[PDB]
Ligand binder design. Structure first.
Ligand code: MTN
Ligand code: CL
Ligand code: CL
Ligand code: CL
Length: 162
């Protein structure tokens, strides 16, 4: 298991524009196109992202290209953020993947706001952090996915993904 395999499980793979759990246009492996309600707007974003006039449909290779970019972007977002970098630096490789997962789903700014959870993670108080993370819109709206991520923080193993 690794961050790519982990997110592939959590996000799935779809080659045509679809709406994610929040109702936002998305494609590939959890690649958010836009929060705009306009499908035309989403198609424009797709064309711009892929570099060609698509039909709202991409290839698997193209999906994986966006995925590579998105994972890299999540890591880069963590390392540039004053709140997230210290936490990331303090973690083992498995829990680092869990943090990348959260940033992939919710964005840098969103996760950076989890001030109390982040403190508990940096303190390595895993059970308490797990309880605190569950007190969130994140957990309530995507409980199974959040449970997997939280379990990863709790145990520092990949047990939730096996
Ligand atoms: S939350 C991760 C976890 C570890 C283990 C003790 C194996 N579990 O049963 C759960 C799923 C609670
Ligand atoms: Cl998804
Ligand atoms: Cl709550
Ligand atoms: Cl879920």
């Amino acid at each position: 298991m690794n961050i790519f395999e982990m997110l592939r499980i959590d996000e799935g793979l779809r080659l045509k524009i679809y709406k994610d759990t929040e109702g936002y246009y998305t494609i590939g492996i959890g690649h958010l196109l836009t929060k705009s309600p306009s499908l035309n707007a989403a198609k424009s974003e797709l064309d711009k992202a892929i570099g060609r006039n698509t039909n709202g449909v991409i290839t698997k290779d193209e999906a994986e290209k966006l995925f590579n970019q998105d994972v890299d972007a999540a890591v880069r977002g963590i390392l540039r953020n004053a709140k997230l970098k210290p936490v990331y630096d303090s973690l083992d490789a498995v829990r680092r993947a869990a943090l990348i997962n959260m940033v992939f789903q919710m964005g840098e700014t969103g996760v950076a706001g989890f001030t109390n959870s982040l403190r508990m993670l940096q303190q390595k108080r895993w059970d308490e952090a797990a309880v605190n993370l569950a007190k969130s819109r994140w957990y309530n709206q995507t409980p199974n996915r959040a449970k997997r991520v939280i379990c990863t923080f709790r145990t520092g193993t990949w047990d939730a993904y096996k």
